[model samples]
Target: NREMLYLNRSDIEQAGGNHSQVYVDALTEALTAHAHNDFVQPLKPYLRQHIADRIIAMPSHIGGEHAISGIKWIGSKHDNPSKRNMERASGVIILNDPETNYPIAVMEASLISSMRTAAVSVIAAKHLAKKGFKDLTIIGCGLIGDKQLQSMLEQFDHIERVFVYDQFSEACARFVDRWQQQRPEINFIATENAKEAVSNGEVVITCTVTDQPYIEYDWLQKGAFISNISIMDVHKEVFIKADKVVVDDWSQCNREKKTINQLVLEGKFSKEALHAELGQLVTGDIPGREDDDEIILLNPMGMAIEDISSAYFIYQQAQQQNIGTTLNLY
Candidate 1:
């Protein structure tokens, strides 16, 4: 008989803010292990309902100090908001004990997903974004967009201004209003157009649900750090033209039919054109931002290791504090 811990949304949220050095470090460690071939990450192919609606199952095993294995089952529907009046995405993660492979916990993964996604950006920023990084442009103002802004602001103290744009004017307005009040020291401006929002940003983040590409090469500023978090927002030209391009994992990014990955499959791009996987840069196996004038793009196809690592952290904290429900499975 085994007992399992259940961490609901409330329990995960109560643990602490996920936008901190702790999580950044955890994600980095996980990536390092990944680079060392200490983890098993099979191909994660998305099952599509439509171009922008799909569900994905990602499973991985983390070796070394944090020896755990888990799967994150997540789904997203771009029309959820207008259709069902619900959040666009939702998911859960299940962790298993490495030794016996018994289920150890089931935790809400939406928040964990957002946190780890942002944390990967932060890690990339640490190695790629220019010193004195300030302006940030966010092209999407939805849930994932909001998390990216919040986490970046929390981790980067020098951010002085945020330019936001969303297809929905109300979404942009709401995002600006809320974040302005929350971070008064920084300027939060809502833009009427996506190009205007991205034009002058030192760091640009795109988290939209669009299937086609809209971002142009000219919109990016000199020496910009583009966290291509949404995979398909930037034009293919950007991938071909950027001074450097890095991804979380080559296999993960090269699959999934993402813009750049699709280019690779079409022979328009090759591994030689990609500078490095983020882990290679983090581990100092490859160079990052050799020149201040280099424009860098980071494409992170969200990984199960990131979710499982962060979930494990929250699980440990919950255990120490006696939080979450314990269920018996006899």
Candidate 2:
């Protein structure tokens, strides 16, 4: 009988999405596959009806041991939390069988999305952040910010201080309140301003939705690694002044009018300016974190391959462990 799997968020966790390491391993695999030129993807398009609103269609096929195809349909609204009392982003992933070319599974994506996003940052941090780094800074305290911190704390035991800054002090306070109970031993410091967090963060991650750039290069520490996951929070000068600049996909990142895109548009930043794609680092074509004095910046455009990688991994676990429901494709 032809069948398809349905993995709701709970089922996904049962399939191993609960822990950060699962995503770390899955993302690492997909990235290395990408480096080998074993994936197909078109540039994701933004359906923009408003400046602060967008629905992104990301589609890709990853080829390897667990070869599969999938698409992630994600949307974002900057005012979602303030007006709708919901998170800024929500989406779903649909998996398809490459051989028979039939849809195979459908799963909730918000958890997988944010967690995989965190996985990308963490993967880059391992290769870019200074060895024995202690202070971690997060410039936003929303859902994405929370996921970043959770993933970081999960994988990094040496982090002694966490500096969090949100425009709303309550966001930072709430972030601390939520995490302090779980990891009370580690310090969670709520900084009043972004500069305080940015300057002190040995590994600084930007998770804000700001359309404009505010972070300056001078505020960054000598050996800092900036995971610019949110895309537009850092000034253009920071991109130019950083010791090394890397991106998930140069083609994807060079569009969308984001900070890096703006630099490319203005004849400011070029392909030559890049250090290495994360995938290249995974394949060792490029070395990672050569010293304790490099300021590395990772600008990720959030590839569809990553979503499919995480989803297919969970789909496999769901099957082997009997964690999800099966429905007749007929």
Candidate 3:
């Protein structure tokens, strides 16, 4: 069998820039199209297994705080190796056509996986965030935070200011300097405190790794749109105050309480609070940004459907553009 492949981070950049709405649009379209659509059925089984097989934890800390760590393993099914001991780590598999089970492409899923994750956050913003949300606060300035910021920048052109907060002050400083240098017109600053970043910002994005709530519900001003990309960034109280709460998929959120999933389980966060799925908003079943002062919460669990869809798009682009490598599996 012949398998076409793309390798590593560089290919993503060489093929196309990381922050393209084209890829996000492709991902969004695929996901929306598959909602209650046939392609998504087999995909669901893998996603459940993917999350279940992975080990995740929230270890307690001294001040009611906690630390989280997660591990995931993804590979081809036909050539699938034993979970306990496996040599070939086939990062992710794409059966181009699930029905025919054709090997369409194989690419390093690590970065694209991350990109789709951040892209989902952007999708959340597009659907749920307020209009003219010029100022944004991003908690934690790591790889995911960086991608999340870039994805937002691509989607919302009106955003003018960025407030970055990180416990590691130096890293935060460097992140601001690099992005500022890259896009000087867009004002970017590094802050030492989370409070300053959280309060009064039109859109608040928390990418913190802390298990305890990093954002205080009282600190958040009225009518702010919050995107907690980090699990457990917002306490239960935060959800209680939200005027609207939307997720990628209600069923998936019900199954897992990693982030906003908990509110979904508790029945505290309502489906009415959920204005619409990001995909539904994309297709205009629900209106976006109904009012200037609407409190919105979007929880994106980073679906595997996005990963597969994005990888599928990248594969097509690579082939059309004559990028990546080819390897034979005999």
Candidate 4:
């Protein structure tokens, strides 16, 4: 018989506060550990019904400071919002004790997932974006985009203006209206098109649910840092023509039939063209941005280690503050 802690959305949110730096540091360490073979991450397989509707199983074991392990089983349906007026994605994470393999905690993971994803972008931006960078462009003003801006503002103080674009004008309006009140110090501008959104940004992030390519190379500025978080928004020419292209993991990114990575598997793209993985830069094994004139692209196919590591941190916080509900499992 054992007791398990259940962290609902409210509990998780209350426990998570200003964790931007925490997540950035943890993710950086996790990536470095993963690069050194200190973690075990398998290929995430999808149960798909449509291009935008699928359930994914992301499992990983993170060793080092936070030596726990967990799996995040998440599902995303593009029709959820329109059909049920609910969020597009929902899921839970199960954390297990590494020593005995006992389930220790069950947590609502949608928030964790968004925050961790945003953290990864900010961490990359820290190393890739130019000094005194002020402008940020966001394509797709959804939940992930909102979280990205929140986490970036928490981690980087240089951002003064944000340009945003979405297919639905209402989505852009909602994103700007909400974030404008939240961060009055920064100007939040809703642009008419993607081109206007990305035109002058020092850091451009794409988190759309689109499965097609549209972004062009001509829209990006020199020394721009693009966080291709959605994995499929940019044209293949972006990867081929970028000054430096980086990914979180070669094996993971090269799978799942993602646009650029899929091209790599189909022999249309070359691996030698890749500059380095994010971990290599974090570990100082490679450089991030060589000069202010180089265009850098970072495509991080969200890693499970990120979710697990963030869950571990939240679990620690819950334990310290005596949060969450305890359930007896016999």
| Residue-by-residue lDDT tens digits, candidate 3, 1-330 | 656464455776676636656567666665566453424322233432332233221111111011111112353332233454442223543434433444555566556755777777777777777767789888887666887888888888899999888988987998999999978999997775989888857889887656677677777767788887775788777777776776676666666645555766677665666666767777777776777667777766555556656666666667778787776655
lDDT of 2: 0.89
Judging by lDDT against the true structure, name the best candidate.
Answer: 2
Which lDDT tens digits does candidate 4 get at residues 1-330?
699899988888778734576677668778789778799988888888667799999999988765888999999999999899999999999999999999899999898898889988987887898978999998998888888888988878889999999999998999899899988889999998899998878999998998788889989999999999998899998988889998998887776566666677777666788898888888888888889999999988888999998888888898888999999978
Where does the lowest 10-residue lDDT sum fall in candidate 4?
17-26
Model 1, runs deviating above 4 Å: 265-267
lDDT, each prediction: 0.87, 0.89, 0.65, 0.87
In Å, residue 63's CA in model 4 sits off its true spot by 2.2
- List where candidate 2 sits over 4 angstroms from the true fold: 50-52
Per-model root-mean-square deviation over C-alphas: 1.5, 1.4, 9.6, 1.5
What value does the lDDT take at residue 290 in candidate 3? Answer: 76
* TM-score on alpha carbons, each prediction: 0.96, 0.96, 0.80, 0.96
lDDT of 4 at 102: 90
What is the number of backbone collisions in each predicted candidate, taken in the order shown? 0, 0, 1, 0
What's the lDDT of the predicted structure labeled candidate 3? 0.65
Residue 227 in model 4: shift from native, Å?
0.1
Residue 213 lDDT in model 1? 82
**How far in Å is the alpha carbon of 110 misplaced in model 2?**
0.5
TM-score of decoy 4: 0.96
